Amino acid sequence: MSTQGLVQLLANAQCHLRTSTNYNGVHTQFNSALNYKNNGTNTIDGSEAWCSSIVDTNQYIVAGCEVPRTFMCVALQGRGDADQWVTSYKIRYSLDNVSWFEYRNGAAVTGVTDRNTVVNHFFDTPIRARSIAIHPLTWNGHISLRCEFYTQPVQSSVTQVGADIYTGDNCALNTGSGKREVVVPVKFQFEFATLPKVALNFDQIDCTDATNQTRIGVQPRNITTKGFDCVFYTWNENKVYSLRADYIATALE
Amino acid sequence: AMSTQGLVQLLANAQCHLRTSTNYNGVHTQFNSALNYKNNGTNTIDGSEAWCSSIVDTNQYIVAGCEVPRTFMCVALQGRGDADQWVTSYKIRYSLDNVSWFEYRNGAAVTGVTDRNTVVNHFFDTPIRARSIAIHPLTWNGHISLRCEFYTQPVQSSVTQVGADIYTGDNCALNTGSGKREVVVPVKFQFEFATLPKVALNFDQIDCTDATNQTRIGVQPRNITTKGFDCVFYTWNENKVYSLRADYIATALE
Amino acid sequence: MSTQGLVQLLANAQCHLRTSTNYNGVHTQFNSALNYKNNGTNTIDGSEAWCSSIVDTNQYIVAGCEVPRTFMCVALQGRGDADQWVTSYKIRYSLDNVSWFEYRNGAAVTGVTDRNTVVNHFFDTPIRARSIAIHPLTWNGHISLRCEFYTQPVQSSVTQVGADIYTGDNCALNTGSGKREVVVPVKFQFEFATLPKVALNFDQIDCTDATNQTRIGVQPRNITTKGFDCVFYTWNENKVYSLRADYIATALE
Ligand SMILES: CC(=O)N[C@@H]1[C@@H](O)[C@@H](O)[C@@H](CO)O[C@H]1O
Ligand SMILES: CC(=O)N[C@@H]1[C@@H](O)[C@@H](O)[C@@H](CO)O[C@H]1O
Ligand SMILES: CC(=O)N[C@@H]1[C@@H](O)[C@@H](O)[C@@H](CO)O[C@H]1O
Ligand SMILES: [Ca+2]
Ligand SMILES: [Ca+2]
Ligand SMILES: [Ca+2]
Ligand code: NI
């Protein structure tokens, strides 16, 4: 329940994993997910953990996401099939993948004390990053671990801007009375994957007041993934020579 | 090949992370999972022409994870290149938000393959919008061994910058004179776009005098580059414009 | 330094890596990062390089990113622990991951001449792409390499469009004198990860002039990750019957 609603990054295959060294080809980051278990009857499939080949304070596993995330928690766990585990570690991270930073200026975070009991560390403040790395500092037996990172869910948007949708000069809004429209079909440069929402706002106004009142409007109608109808309008006795608008359409997920 | 023309081949294009339940050993891993992967047939040490599991039961899987949502059209399954092992039926599971997972067809079996090399495409009953997708073998011949591909619609990526409150100043130069008149306010984006953006630039504050009952006001970008643009406020005819304010939305694609 | 300020993709775990073949499970792309070094006293952790299984002109390593990048440079390096290196190679790439292209129309790019001296190749023109591949053409000893790709920093945005925030008909701005506001609170469909910037622009105007002057405005106040206050206003003697606006809110990184 503590990590309820959060994204399990490794379990969802949301990150690339790079390690400093691997003991051999069956002790790699392929075997790093929290609660990873393998065939206990066969030795050939290796460790229930990522295990390094060099045992020093310079090893690490780094998880990289191309989409920034808010990291709430890192969970550590020992090796499932042997008495090896990381007792403390530091966390480093980068948001822009140019400059790196250290959590708590590099101070240790409390790890685990056995093979299987997970220890969650909720960061003192949530970390905004693309890439994050566990750097083992002290260990029992060997530098061997399983892990997970828990992030807020991400949302993804795609936006298209289109400029200068125009009624034309001396348009139909410039004669008659009551509610009047000039409809201009608009087609997006590319079709959205899901239905967009559309903002559509004025950039050029050429209109005549009526008993001192300005009455002008622009609104999308019949929004699809492919485009929409830009509806310019006026009402009452107003005469409107022209209206121009820019649009911003955004689809989510 | 024709049936998936124009679709993105995820594994071929290295567009997903692959995680497996188990790997037989270090030369039977997801590194060997791509459709039509072939290796050195004269040397045994490079392993299988397939991902092969370690535990042989109904709880195995390969998960493909994408950080950017995709419309999955099809999954292609193929047997192992170098030995008589293949998956004969499987289920598909997926997640869009990476919090809740769902089973395609409520977990009903999907038809797999019947030999080493003949690909069997499954186009999903309805295309699936997802970030992560998993193949869960249900029945097999010999061992749990496969090569696979996922086909998605091409994705488009945009990057957007909003800037607020580009302003003429009070009692600006548009508030005197006749004919077409402009006040130009250079705008620099917070960061340089990778490619040329398109720019929406629209009013949020208007302070103007009509001219024989006509309002005449405009704002338009000029000289748009990846670094910024010129915000041109204007009026025309005999109109006097005290001030105009605008916000901008600039978006670059791909 | 020639690559200062650029993102090191492999170092930052920003790409998936697929290879044509791997010599065995300790000669894989897990060992491919520039300057990768392993345990030199133990043979079991394999090569300081990705090494192919098949030695021909058809091998490759592909780096894939879901987020388009601007590729500035590819760095090649030999194998750290043996006299094997790639002397020339070609580059191929794809932006849409459907159509692929060859750099220099397939012509050779100069590789390396020893184990450890890095040779940077800055592309004739930067390449905009999602996926990129090194294809060895000639080699010493075996097809064995370490590498890096250097890209411009990327920025990520998330955008929400909200339509039709409205004062109501015959709103409070339609009476009185002096600066007057009507405040409409707005909650975004979802909470942004970081503080957004907000564009808020007119789509319907219904107002009276005052001694021929139009005076109208709309502005966000108290923007948070969760929403903002939409402030519609007028001033002086103007009477405004109604105003309507659409918003566009974007958060970076
Ligand atoms: C139905 C109609 O035209 N209603 C208008 C209203 O929009 C507003 O302009 C008001 C100003 O006092 O005048 C009304 O006549
Ligand atoms: C060149 C010029 O000023 N053209 C204006 C036109 O924009 C519009 O306002 C029209 C209204 O009847 O009047 C014209 O004088
Ligand atoms: C404090 C105030 O109302 N200032 C207004 C100014 O905004 C502008 O409209 C100008 C038009 O000449 O008139 C001034 O009275
Ligand atoms: Ca415009
Ligand atoms: Ca504004
Ligand atoms: Ca609207
Ligand atoms: Ni990966």
Give the residue, by CA position, lying nearest to ligand 1 atom 11: C241
Closest residue in C to B25 (Cα) is: C25
Closest residue in B to C71 (Cα) is: B194
| Residue B126 in contact with partner chain A when CB distance is under 8 A | no
A203 vs B198: CB contact, 8 Å cut-off? no
Residues of A in contact with B23 (CB under 8 A): 26, 30, 45
| Residue C16 in contact with partner chain A when CB distance is under 8 A | yes
Determine the Cα–Cα distance for residues A127 and A187; give it in Å rounded to an integer. Answer: 40
Residues with CB under 6 A from ligand 3: B 207, 242; C 213, 215, 235-236
For A218, the closest of C39, C45, C203 (CB atoms) is C203
| Residue B205 in contact with partner chain A when CB distance is under 8 A | no
Cβ neighbours for C23, distance < 8 A, ≥ 6 positions apart: B45, B46, C47, C51, C52, C53, C142
CB C47 within 8 A of CB C39: no
CA-nearest of C190, B229, C222 to A246 is B229
CA-nearest of C105, C33, C119, C42 to C76 is C119
| Residue C163 in contact with partner chain B when CB distance is under 8 A | no
CA-nearest of A172, A230, A160 to A201 is A230
Give the residue, by CA position, lying nearest to ligand 1 atom 2: A236
CA-nearest of C238, C230, C159, C178 to C200 is C230
Burial class (CB in 10 A: 0-12, 13-18, 19+), C213: middle
Quick check: CB of B59 below 6 Å from ligand 2? no
| Residue A163 in contact with partner chain B when CB distance is under 8 A | yes
User: How many Cβ atoms sit within 10 Å of the Cβ of residue C129?
Assistant: 26
Determine the Cα–Cα distance for residues A156 and A65; give it in Å rounded to an integer. Answer: 14
Determine the Cα–Cα distance for residues C187 and A177; give it in Å rounded to an integer. Answer: 37
User: How many Cβ atoms sit within 10 Å of the Cβ of residue C121?
Assistant: 15
A30 vs B27: CB contact, 8 Å cut-off? no
Touching subunits of B (3+ CB pairs, under 8 Å) are A, C
Task: Map chain A to HEC letters.
Answer: CCCCCCEECCCCCCCEEEECCCCCCCCCHHHCECCCCCCCCCCCCCCCCEECCCCCCCCCEEEEEEEEEEEEEEEEECCCCCCCEEEEEEEEEECCCCCCEEHHHHCCEECCCCCCCCEEEEEEEEEEEEEEEEEEEEEECCCEEEEEEEECCCCCEEEEEEEEEECCCCCHHHCCCCCEEEEEEEECCCCCCCCCEEEEEEEEEEEECECCEEEEEEEEECCCCCEEEEEEEECCCCEEEEEEEEEEEEEEC
Determine the Cα–Cα distance for residues C124 and C147; give it in Å rounded to an integer. Answer: 19
B99 vs A6: CB contact, 8 Å cut-off? yes
| Domains contained in chain C, CATH given | 1-154 (2.60.120.260), 155-253 (2.60.40.2080)
Where on the phi/psi map is residue B67: left (φ > 0), alpha (ψ -120 to 50), or beta? Answer: alpha
Residues of B in contact with C128 (CB under 8 A): 194-195, 254
> Could you tell me how many helices (H) and strands (E) chain C has, helices first?
0, 15
First to last CA, chain B: 26
| Residue C160 in contact with partner chain B when CB distance is under 8 A | no
B162 vs C248: CB contact, 8 Å cut-off? yes
Cβ neighbours for C176, distance < 8 A, ≥ 6 positions apart: none
First to last CA, chain A: 26
Query: Ligand 4 centre from B221 Cα, in Å?
Result: 7
| Residue B210 in contact with partner chain C when CB distance is under 8 A | yes
| Way the structure was solved | X-ray
First to last CA, chain C: 26
Determine the Cα–Cα distance for residues B142 and B48; give it in Å rounded to an integer. Answer: 14
Closest residue in B to A31 (Cα) is: B22
Task: Report the alpha-carbon angle A108-A112-A117, nearest 5.
Answer: 150
CA distance C107 to chain A (A): 31
Determine the Cα–Cα distance for residues A81 and B174; give it in Å rounded to an integer. Answer: 78
Amino acid at A213: Q
| Residue C230 in contact with partner chain A when CB distance is under 8 A | no
Instruction: Identify the residue whose tokens are 């790709």.
Output: C149
Residues of B in contact with A5 (CB under 8 A): 99
Which residues in chain B (64-93) have CB-CB distances under 8 A to chain C? 66-68
CA distance B108 to chain C (A): 31
The alpha carbon dihedral of B170, B189, A225, C188 has a sign of: negative
CA-nearest of B55, B63, B52, B122 to B87 is B52
Say whether B225 sits in a helix, a strand or coil: coil
Determine the Cα–Cα distance for residues B187 and B203; give it in Å rounded to an integer. Answer: 15
User: How many Cβ atoms sit within 10 Å of the Cβ of residue C29?
Assistant: 20
Give the residue, by CA position, lying nearest to ligand 2 atom 2: B237
Query: Ligand 3 centre from B209 Cα, in Å?
Result: 10
Please, what's the b/e burial string for B136-168 (b: 16 or more CB within 10 A of its CB; e: otherwise)? Answer: bbbebbebbbbbbbbbbbbbbbbbbbbbbebbb
